[PDB]
């Protein structure tokens, strides 16, 4: 039931004079916004990506992000000019909010440096990560002391502005986020487990939402050796899943793949393994 909205940023600093930034907005795993880094503007990926916010609100946010990117990818280089050979390095930022089932908002703002936790924002203060050392302490010192209401602005953004935006997005995107899309399925062979053995694969693709049930069956007996892949993304907001089973040659006959999904409304997909059984 917990739903979340995150703005992510990836900064790659190659040397003292050269860096590249990338940024995007995500509603759970659904990308809803991009950033045009040259014009410095928000890209609204869906008709409903404005949420319920006004154009004045969204343009003020754009300007906030611009001022911020300025300050960040200036001060970072100014300081990393001294400690070169650290180059190339990469900074990741994940800022957002999570709404719990009772409605309680929870904000976060985590930073990573070269893929390790650098710091995070816990209450009203920037706390360095235990692992990383004096670097995290330096960054936290500059944020907690030199920088004015960027701490206060982050606070209001991730605790009040972000929940409001998330809910407005869910509402504005009502017909999209509540949609049901039916999968299709098909069988294939996978890589040979061994001589005298077969790998049966049942592909299920195009379903939404993500909960799905897929099993190899012998009539009504679920086959215990079934392995479920990870649920993988398709373009345009559906999902893909592989279910596989290794079987001895001569024991594949009679096996079927069975797929259940909310979109199917009790009409499961059943596919029987044929292989080279049919001349």
């Amino acid at each position: 039931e917990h739903v979340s909205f995150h703005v992510i940023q990836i900064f790659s600093f190659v040397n003292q004079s050269w860096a590249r930034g990338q940024g995007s907005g995500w509603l759970d795993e659904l990308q809803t916004h991009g950033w045009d880094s040259e014009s410095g503007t928000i890209i609204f990926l869906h008709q409903w990506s404005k949420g319920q916010f006004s154009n004045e609100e969204l343009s003020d946010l754009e300007l906030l992000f611009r001022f911020y990117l300025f300050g960040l990818t200036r001060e970072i280089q100014d300081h990393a000019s001294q400690d070169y050979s650290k180059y190339p390095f990469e900074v990741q930022v994940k800022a957002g909010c999570e709404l719990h089932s009772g409605g309680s908002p929870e904000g976060f703002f985590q930073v990573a440096f070269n893929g390790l936790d650098l710091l995070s924002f816990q209450q009203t203060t920037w706390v360095p990560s235990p692992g990383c050392g004096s670097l995290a302490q330096s960054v936290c010192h500059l944020l907690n002391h030199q920088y004015e209401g960027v701490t206060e602005t982050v606070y209001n953004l991730i605790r009040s502005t972000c929940p409001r935006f998330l809910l407005g997005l869910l509402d504005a995107g009502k017909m999209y986020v509540h949609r049901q899309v039916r999968p299709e399925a098909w069988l294939s062979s996978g890589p040979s487990p061994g001589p005298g053995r077969l790998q049966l694969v049942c592909h299920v693709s195009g379903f939404y939402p993500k909960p799905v049930w897929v099993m190899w069956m012998r009539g009504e007996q679920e086959q215990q050796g079934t392995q479920l892949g990870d649920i993988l993304p398709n373009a345009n907001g559906t999902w893909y899943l592989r279910a596989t089973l290794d079987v001895a040659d001569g024991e594949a006959a009679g096996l079927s793949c069975r797929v259940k999904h909310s979109s199917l409304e009790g009409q499961d997909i059943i596919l029987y393994w044929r292989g080279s059984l049919v001349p």
């Binding site: 990836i10 995007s24 990308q31 994940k94 195009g206 993988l232």
Partner: protein
């Protein structure tokens, strides 16, 4: 972390039937990477990819996709070069 590569079509493969080839590349770090979808060993220009994203452990992931038509003669693949790889990895699509 090394990139993991998964290749999959959007619909059942049918020779002579338009379809989409997906390559999902994940769990890598740092973000610099070269992912190409290949037709007969040649890079496919008309490709789409998601904007870069990362998981809770900070490893990156991307989804590539391109329209394609499976053919008995044609070979399709996903090629990844990364700083953690000595040579480009290639994962070929079959079935």
């Amino acid at each position: 972390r090394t990139p993991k590569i998964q290749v999959y079509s959007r619909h059942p493969a049918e020779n002579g039937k338009s379809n989409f080839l997906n390559c999902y590349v994940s769990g890598f770090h740092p973000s610099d990477i070269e992912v190409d979808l290949l037709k007969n060993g040649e890079r496919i220009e008309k490709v789409e990819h998601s904007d870069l994203s990362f998981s809770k452990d900070w490893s990156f992931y991307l989804l590539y996709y391109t329209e394609f038509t499976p053919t008995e003669k044609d070979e399709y693949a996903c090629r990844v070069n990364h700083v953690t790889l000595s040579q480009p990895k290639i994962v070929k699509w079959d079935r």
